[PDB]
Design a binder for these strands. Structure first.
Ligand SMILES: [Zn+2]
Length: 252
DNA sequence: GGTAGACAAGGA
DNA sequence: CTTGTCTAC
């Protein structure tokens, strides 16, 4: 899921788990557990803690408990659901947190790409994987100046810069293409080639694009089809990855 | 020290 | 194939 989907998960999962006490943690694919490295220590330390909150950083969910934070990335297709301990597990359930009220927080992930790190709360933000994360796109910390400062230090594509989690948190592929389109900038352009009016436009389209999604696509997945503004066939190439979609006329 | 590819996997 | 980032050069 993209940042807006994760924020939707954050918001809807929280009431379903807040104030619940962990009685057991069950793990069926231990590699999902990245810290502590031993999954039995991961399970043991969680037990007896009550869930107090749920926050989001980039595409990371941060479950806040009594002493610890659980940092969770869904990556490709992880999913959480709350359900009764009396029901059979859905397929591809790899981690289950059992609550004292007989309900469960279940983590499913067909790919098994998702990760989990548990640290003392105070430590979470200065450890992998939150440590080097860039500012939230929708916050004051992510500004034209911050974006300007990074662009002018590197020769790589403006798309590659924006996909860099240290520049800005959780800006997905779909939103990079869309934002660049709306700002009229080519995804393959060197970051250091952008004018200051250009970075200000990009910054402002980044915030609007991600901001509308949080609360109708122009280029993403639309290759071969008429651009919605000028009617020029949308084109698809490879930039910093990765499927890159753009209009050759609208974007410069 | 600055940046990709490497790397995690089960199904078309 | 299909994705996100942080470890590896
Ligand atoms: Zn166009």
């Amino acid at each position: 899921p993209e940042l807006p989907e994760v924020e939707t998960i954050r918001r809807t999962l929280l009431p379903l788990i807040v104030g619940k006490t962990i009685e057991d943690v069950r793990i069926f694919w231990p590699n999902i557990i990245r810290h502590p490295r031993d999954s039995e220590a991961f399970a043991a330390r969680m037990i007896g803690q009550t869930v107090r909150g749920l926050e989001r950083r980039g595409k990371f969910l941060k479950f806040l408990l009594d002493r610890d934070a659980l940092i969770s990335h869904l990556r490709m297709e992880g999913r959480y659901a709350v359900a009764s301990a009396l029901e059979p597990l859905e397929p591809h359930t790899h981690v289950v947190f059992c609550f004292t009220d007989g309900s469960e927080l279940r983590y499913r992930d067909v790919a098994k790409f998702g990760t989990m790190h548990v640290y003392a709360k105070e430590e979470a933000d200065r450890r992998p994987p939150l440590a080097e994360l860039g500012p939230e796109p929708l916050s004051p910390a992510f500004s034209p100046a911050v974006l300007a400062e990074r662009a002018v230090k590197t020769k790589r594509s403006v798309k590659a810069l924006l996909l860099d989690c240290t520049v800005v948190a959780g800006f997905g592929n779909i939103y990079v293409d869309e934002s660049l389109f709306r700002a009229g900038i080519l995804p393959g352009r060197p970051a250091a080639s952008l004018s200051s009016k250009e970075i200000e436009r990009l910054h402002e389209e980044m915030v609007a694009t991600i901001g509308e999604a949080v609360m109708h696509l122009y280029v993403y997945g639309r290759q071969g089809n008429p651009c919605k503004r000028c009617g020029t066939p949308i084109e698809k190439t490879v930039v910093a990855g990765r499927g890159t979609h753009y209009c050759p006329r609208c974007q410069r």
